[PDB]
Design a protein around this ligand. Structure first.
Ligand SMILES: O=C(N[C@H]1c2cccc(O)c2C[C@@H]1C(=O)O)c1ccc2[nH]c(CO)nc2c1
Length: 167
């Protein structure tokens, strides 16, 4: 038993809710919140900009030190950093950005990072400003992630569509 409330159960291990991931993290304090990161950990907009704003830019400060030490992530890769006031940990995961021409097949590799964590609050990778089809992203998520994933979908209209078209 865990504290996520109001989710619709899609599969054995995937749940989904129309929610603001920032508000969900602050209420739930999950062990892991997933950020829709880029390779530079520049949290300017979309989910990343919202999560970072909620941390009063502490996420960005920590991220800049990470990059200065380690260099950029790989597309499809991830790193674990602090969750600040939102979660114990933040798993920064880089899905391919279609608006940068990145290979969509890397989406499966990106979701594989979730399997290193028993339970996660997460957005749909490569959705929103990353330019992928959220329905495809949901399919890859369901077919790749084996751990328990609680997906927060900000847009109500999109949430309903994802549910209604789910196979
Ligand atoms: O853009 C946002 N989320 C979408 C996104 C973005 C980039 C890559 C992605 O893969 C996805 C998928 C994610 C989604 O479909 O839910 C977002 C989420 C919460 C927000 N809270 C505020 C306050 O103003 N702005 C927000 C923006």
């Amino acid at each position: 038993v865990n504290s996520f409330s109001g989710y619709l159960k899609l599969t054995d291990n995937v749940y989904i809710k129309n929610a603001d991931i920032v508000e969900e993290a602050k209420k739930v304090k999950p062990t892991v919140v997933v950020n829709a990161a880029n390779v530079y950990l520049k949290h300017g907009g979309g989910v990343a900009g919202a999560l970072n704003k909620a941390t009063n830019n502490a996420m960005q400060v920590e991220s800049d030190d990470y990059i200065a030490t380690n260099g950029p992530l790989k597309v499809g890769g991830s790193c674990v950093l602090s969750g600040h006031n939102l979660a114990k940990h933040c798993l920064h995961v880089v899905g391919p950005n279609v608006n940068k021409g990145e290979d969509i097949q890397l989406l499966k590799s990106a979701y594989e990072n979730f399997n290193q964590h028993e339970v996660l609050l997460a957005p749909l990778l490569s959705a929103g400003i990353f330019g992928a089809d959220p329905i495809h992203s949901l399919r890859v998520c369901v077919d790749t992630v084996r751990t328990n994933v609680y997906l927060a979908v900000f847009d109500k209209n999109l949430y309903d569509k994802l549910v209604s078209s789910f196979l």
